[PDB]
Amino acid sequence: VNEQVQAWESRRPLIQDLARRLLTDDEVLAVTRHCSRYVHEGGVEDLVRPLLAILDRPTKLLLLRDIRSVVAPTDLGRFDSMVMPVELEAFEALKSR
Numbered sequence: 001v002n003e004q005v006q007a008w009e010s011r012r013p014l015i016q017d018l019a020r021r022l023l024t025d026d027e028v029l030a031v032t033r034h035c036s037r038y039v040h041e042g043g044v045e046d047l048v049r050p051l052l053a054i055l056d057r058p059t060k061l062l063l064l065r066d067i068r069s070v071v072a073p074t075d076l077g078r079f080d081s082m083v084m085p086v087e088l089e090a091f092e093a094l095k096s097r
């Protein structure tokens with residue numbers, strides 16, 4: 001928790017600032033709550049699943065960059081198993097336009 005909580009507290013201003021430029025305030029509050037819950041209680045699938053439902057456009061996926069920095073080392077493989085296919089689909093969405 002502690003290193004991840006420290007990483008979150010140091011990156012929260014960037015994450016929240018970018019989130020508010022891309023999402024509604026209610027969605028920013030949801031992202032904030034999911035990130036805080038994860039760093040304090042763990043469970044990386046419970047962080048990613050709701051984020052992928054909120055971050056529903058390629059530009060919104062930019063938020064996952066700084067969020068990955070708060071993911072505990074033992075959770076990174078799962079995070080990437082879930083997010084990497086979504087990054088590729090988003091590139092396809094930008095390309096097919």
Ligand SMILES: C[C@H](CO)OC[C@@H](C)OC[C@H](C)OC[C@@H](C)O
Nearest residue numbers: 061062063064065066068083087
């Ligand atoms: C979607 C967004 C940009 O497409 O990147 C996703 C997110 C998981 O960041 C990837 C990772 C943190 O950085 C990869 C770079 C540093 O090579």
